[PDB]
Ligand binder design. Structure first.
Ligand code: VTV
Ligand code: MG
Lengths: 541, 405
């Protein structure tokens, strides 16, 4: 006997206050009970379980399912899961293939035999007890309890990965020239060494796994590893080609998933559509690009792997209608990955703020995948950006970036004046509505005696205040001072939307684009501010 | 030697807060740091049975090129049972001519931590691209940035300094988290000496650095009104708007005679001479504004609120209050990153927090004029304090920005 090192036990406990499981063994067939006894007897020969006496009051239902060749024991731990403590899930975000680095040689090993070489905490075995109902219920069923992480128990994945990692640590520490990844019951070991000096280092690792009695089978996977919905190749990666099925939803996640390598995977008209009740036709004619989504996913696209000696670059584009598209690369047209950004649901917005949010999303994505920020290429002029952030009332920032001249370009569509314009007409505007009737008026009076009041139906104080301002923009020349008492309208206009949901706001924006100079001034209401005092009388009743 | 008992509040579990993404250079520094701390027994690897987590990152303190590990214990702190047995706040600290801030964090580690509680101090060094599992650790000794670290350590602390205190009986010393605030009424040369003297007790019983703050200040800044020889219609519209706003803070503000001037429909740039009535009304408003507000009291039970406005050109205004329009402190920060708005806002938050510790011994809740996703992406790259306050985000431009310029 060559002494094997013990695998250290993880102390497991049940959720505080909760007690173990007491489920009732369901009725089987004589045939099924015959099958289960065969399995449990071999497993018992292996140490995987042990026959228990009558003291344990916990039971977990056991079933049998057959057939490819034979039957297999299915132990339903759903109730023990509910009562076992919480575990640190050893990982919840997967690697992204664009972060992987190439290796000359990648060997794959089978480590499945180690899963049932991981002992269960002794004081916890009691809770894994199960009963094989006996033939004709005429004897006490056979009773077992697990000595190893059960297949299907709550803690088994976290404890297994955790245990494999502790074994591998010294070997990976002493061989920095190899990398090791663990996935299901296989290990992947890659290196850039000469094929000889790499095959030896594999021999050392099987040796080192032996010191814990880990029988590593000595035996050729496909160059296309199929992993987590990807296709990893020695030089490229792509998504595992998957497609989308006229009654219809879940194509949103599929189209999103494909969009990380395939460019221009629009999801807007499709996502606009949305319980599982009824499917309507694409009244925004989503088939103009939905058939192009099928045409985009028709040809195959691949991404490259990461090269830490080369810089990292991210390029963004405006796709229109709140949609932004981006690629990240190190050498032109060799994308590491692609993606899209859709605007946040809001009432108003502008292109500069969306682009900023795209940048933040890519920055954070890039820190995750590569641990650094990319250099950005953006469709916005340096001068446009400087003007924006020097005058925006919020703090804003964009990490190192350069202008790329790919139309359409993000621009500022209008810029209010900071001081009143000398020699521009001054329009005092005001508007008001009747809460009961929804009747109101909107209008203005100017220093030159120009005047207007327009009566309105089905309206509110907020709408009439906007409409007053719209009226002065419509009826003035290229330069104009406007005086309102609407804090609501000032809040909207000073946030500088370039696009709105409200069609009134959009018409004001369109008037703003056409002017040369606009000064907007706020005064408080009901205070006799002349002009605003004179137009309040005309518009309130 | 004796791990003081400690437990969370009733009906509350340990924190399970996700670790956020860190850059490769910050991962490396945390690895070097945590490797040494482990060899000194301050922390230890943990297994998957520990589900708790607290975010961790790395900074460089002010005037140092060495990475420092900072743990965001904000969640742990709000679920740690409030400690007792006296720190009262010294009202004279804010009145001293000088106050130095000493990083005394390392003293905490010489003290074991109650075994049962360590599992709640769990934290993860993340890996790039999730390739390898995180490095999981828990604390063995009192952690920096934890609320109970100063409380627990208050025993030995008071002894490290009874001599110095007995010697200098009108030097004021106060502790907040990992920081010692030392206030004198003397000159900096003698301050540095008496400071370096207090740095000798520490070396015997980042200790080399300090902060040179002069709590000398003017409390709630006055509202100020223009003095002009000629007034346009627009100057008077803005004045009436400012006086209307101040009227919700001050009584007897009147705008009737100034609005009389605004009768008519004149052009915005037209000069308006002032009436005899209007000039008196402005003078009486001015007199009203010279006295501070009256019924303004701090209540130690309630939260402090800090508002910050970007004024442009590297200027920032801020107000601290507890109920709106009853300001306890207002201020203005100028040029100090002239191409980085976010670095400036972060430095502003830090200074405002520091001042709030000096005056009241607690930190305010900020209302930041920034979009959440931008602040969350970048604030840790400019943060240099061992503590962290709470914040929320303003998405509508306050009209009141002008009234503080
Ligand atoms: C086919 C890819 C390949 O040959 N390259 C050289 C690059 C990717 C790579 C490099 C090094 C290792 Cl070790 C590697 O192995 C892994 C890594 C991951 Cl995340 C998943 C799987 C699976 N299944 C296998 C994968
Ligand atoms: Mg109005």
């Amino acid at each position: 006997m060559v002494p094997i090192s013990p695998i250290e036990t993880v102390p497991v406990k049940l959720k505080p206050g909760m007690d173990g499981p007491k489920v009732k063994q369901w009725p089987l067939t004589e045939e099924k009970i015959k099958a289960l006894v065969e399995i449990c007897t071999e497993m018992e020969k292996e140490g995987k379980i042990s026959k228990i006496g009558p003291e344990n009051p916990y039971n977990t239902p056991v079933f049998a399912i057959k057939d490819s060749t034979k039957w297999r024991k299915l132990v339903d731990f759903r109730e023990l899961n509910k009562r076992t403590q919480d575990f640190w899930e050893v990982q919840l975000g997967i690697p992204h293939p664009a972060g992987l680095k190439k290796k000359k040689s990648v060997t794959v090993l089978d480590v499945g035999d180690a899963y049932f070489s991981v002992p269960l905490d002794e004081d916890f075995r009691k809770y894994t007890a199960f009963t094989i109902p006996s033939i004709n219920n005429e004897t006490p069923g056979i009773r077992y309890q697990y000595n190893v992480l059960p297949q299907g128990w709550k803690g088994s994945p976290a404890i297994f990965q955790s245990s494999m990692t502790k074994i591998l640590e010294p070997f990976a520490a002493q061989n920095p020239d190899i990398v090791i990844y663990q996935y299901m019951d296989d290990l992947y070991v890659g290196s850039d060494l000469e094929i000889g000096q790499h095959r030896t280092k594999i021999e050392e690792l099987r040796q080192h796994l032996l010191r814990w009695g880990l029988t590593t089978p000595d035996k050729q996977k496909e160059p296309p590893f199929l992993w987590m919905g990807y296709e990893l190749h020695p030089d490229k990666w792509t998504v595992q080609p998957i497609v989308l099925p006229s009654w219809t939803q879940k194509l949103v996640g599929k189209l999103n998933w494909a969009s990380q390598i395939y460019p221009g995977i629009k999801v807007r008209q499709l996502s606009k559509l949305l319980a599982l009740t009824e499917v309507i036709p694409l009244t925004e004619e989503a088939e103009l690009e939905l058939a192009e989504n099928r045409e985009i996913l028709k040809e195959p696209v691949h991404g490259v792997y990461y090269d830490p000696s080369k810089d990292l670059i991210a390029e963004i584009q405006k796709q229109g209608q709140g949609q932004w598209t981006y690629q990240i690369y190190q050498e032109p047209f060799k994308n590491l990955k692609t993606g899209k950004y859709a605007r946040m649901r809001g009432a108003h917005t502008n292109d500069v703020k969306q682009l900023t949010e795209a940048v933040q999303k890519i920055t954070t994505e890039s820190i995750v995948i590569w641990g650094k920020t990319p250099k950005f290429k953006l469709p916005i002029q340096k001068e446009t950006w400087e003007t924006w952030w020097t005058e925006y009332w919020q703090a804003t920032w964009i990490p190192e970036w350069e202008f790329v001249n790919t139309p359409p370009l993000v621009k500022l569509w209008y810029q209010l004046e900071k001081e009143p314009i000398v020699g521009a007409e001054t329009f005092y505007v005001d508007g008001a509505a009747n809460r009961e009737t929804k009747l109101g008026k909107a209008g203005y009076v100017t220093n030159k005696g120009r005047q207007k009041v327009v009566p309105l139906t089905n309206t509110t104080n907020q709408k009439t205040e906007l409409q007053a301002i719209y009226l002065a923009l419509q009826d003035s020349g290229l330069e104009v001072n406007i005086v309102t008492d609407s804090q609501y309208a000032l809040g909207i206009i000073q946030a500088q939307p370039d696009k709105s949901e409200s069609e009134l706001v959009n018409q004001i924006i369109e008037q703003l684009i056409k002017k040369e100079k606009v000064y907007l001034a706020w005064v408080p209401a009901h205070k006799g501010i002349g002009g605003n005092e004179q137009v309040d009388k005309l518009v309130s009743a | 030697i004796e791990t003081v008992p400690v437990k969370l509040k009733p009906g509350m579990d340990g924190p399970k807060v996700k670790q956020w993404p860190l850059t490769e250079e910050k991962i490396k520094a945390l690895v070097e740091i945590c490797t040494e701390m482990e060899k000194e027994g301050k922390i230890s690897k943990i297994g998957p049975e520990n589900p708790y987590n607290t975010p961790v990152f790395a900074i460089k303190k002010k005037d140092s090129t060495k990475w420092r590990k900072l743990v965001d214990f904000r969640e742990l702190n709000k679920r740690t049972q409030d400690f007792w047995e006296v720190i009262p706040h010294p009202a004279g600290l804010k009145k001293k001519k000088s106050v130095t801030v000493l990083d005394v964090g390392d003293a905490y580690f010489s003290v074991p931590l109650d075994e049962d509680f360590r599992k709640y101090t769990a934290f993860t060094i993340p890996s790039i691209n999730n390739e390898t599992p995180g490095i999981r650790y828990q604390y063995n000794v009192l952690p920096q940035g934890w609320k109970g670290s100063p409380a627990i350590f208050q025993s030995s602390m008071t002894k490290i300094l009874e001599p110095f205190k007995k010697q200098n009986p009108d030097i004021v010393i106060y502790q907040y988290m990992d920081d010692l605030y030392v206030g004198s009424d003397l000159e900096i040369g003698q301050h540095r000496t008496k400071i370096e003297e207090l740095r000798q007790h520490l070396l015997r019983w980042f200790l080399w650095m300090g902060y040179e703050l002069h709590p000398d200040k003017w409390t709630v800044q006055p509202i100020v009104l223009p003095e002009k020889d000629s007034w346009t219609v627009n100057d008077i519209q803005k004045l009436v708007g400012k006086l209307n706003w101040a009227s919700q803070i001050y009584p007897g503000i009147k705008v009737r005679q100034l609005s009389k001037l605004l009768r008519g429909t004149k052009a915005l740039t037209e000069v308006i001479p002032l009436t005899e009535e209007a000039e008196l009304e402005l003078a009486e408003n001015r007199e009203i504004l010279k006295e501070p507000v009256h019924g303004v009291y701090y209540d130690p039970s309630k939260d402090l609120i800090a508002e910050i406005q970007k004024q442009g050109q590297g200027q920032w205004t801020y107000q601290i209050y507890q109920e709106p329009f009853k300001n306890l402190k207002t201020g203005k920060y100028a040029r100090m990153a002239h191409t980085n708005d976010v670095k400036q806002l972060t430095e502003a938050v830090q200074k405002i927090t520091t001042e709030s510790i000096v005056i009241w011994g607690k930190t305010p809740k900020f209302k930041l004029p920034i979009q959440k996703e931008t602040w969350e992406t970048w604030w840790t790259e400019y943060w240099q304090a061992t503590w962290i306050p709470e914040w929320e985000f303003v998405n509508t431009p306050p009209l009141v920005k002008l009234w503080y310029q």
